[PDB]
């Protein structure tokens, strides 16, 4: 019990990224951002978060990467607001996956995310 898992490196957490068609939604104090101009590619959801009692406790950062490594989505707690809950993170992932799949994107979650707060069930990818 009580751990801290990191799918991303310091570069991946701090890398600058740009959205052509920015879309921002809010789930609690978590900010969900994604580029609506992304379509027909395989996207992986990588996240850094702490666990406790084998449940996801607190999310540090979540970002969506394409196969080539570009950042196209993000979930992060808002800096000016207090924290979030286990349920808030799952709702945020559902919003990001649902919004990313509306543009025919094949979104997948990492192995650690699949263990504590996953979604989707996934669709087919295009070559």
């Amino acid at each position: 019990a009580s751990r801290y898992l990191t799918d991303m490196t310091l570069e991946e957490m701090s890398r600058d990224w740009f959205m052509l068609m920015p879309k921002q939604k809010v789930a609690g104090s978590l900010c969900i951002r994604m580029d609506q101009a992304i379509m027909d590619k395989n996207i992986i959801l990588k996240a850094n978060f702490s666990v406790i009692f084998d449940r996801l406790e607190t999310l540090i950062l979540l970002r969506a990467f394409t196969e080539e490594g570009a950042i196209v989505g993000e979930i992060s707690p808002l800096p000016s607001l207090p924290g979030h809950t286990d349920e808030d993170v799952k709702n945020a992932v559902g919003v990001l996956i649902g919004g990313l799949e509306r543009n025919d994107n094949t979104v997948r979650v990492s192995e650690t995310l699949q263990r504590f707060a996953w979604r989707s069930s996934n669709e087919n990818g295009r070559p």
Partner: protein, 129 residues
Amino acid sequence: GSKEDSVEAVGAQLKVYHQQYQDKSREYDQLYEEYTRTSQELQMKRTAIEAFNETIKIFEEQGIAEIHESRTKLEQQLRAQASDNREIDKRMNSLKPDLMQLRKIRDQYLVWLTQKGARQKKINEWLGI
């Protein structure tokens, strides 16, 4: 000098947290490298104590005497090294929560600065690249 002052002050805290994480990480690796060093020597002292008293049992049915003191000296050094090896296991056991909490709050400060406008080149300067 207002909202940026908070960004600069928090970015300074990110430096201190980064140093402390790397300072305790460097300390944790010295304890682990020395821990496995002593436990390997505890192993060697152990089977050497075996072959010591096994040279007694193998030739006590027939009957080479001052060898008993060498075995007593080894058993003395064994539990003296195992005692210090236990202290090393206790020192770095109290560091894992320190390393985990420092790493988590370092990442949270990095993310907070990202949400406040600090680009990647700013983050690397506070992180020492």
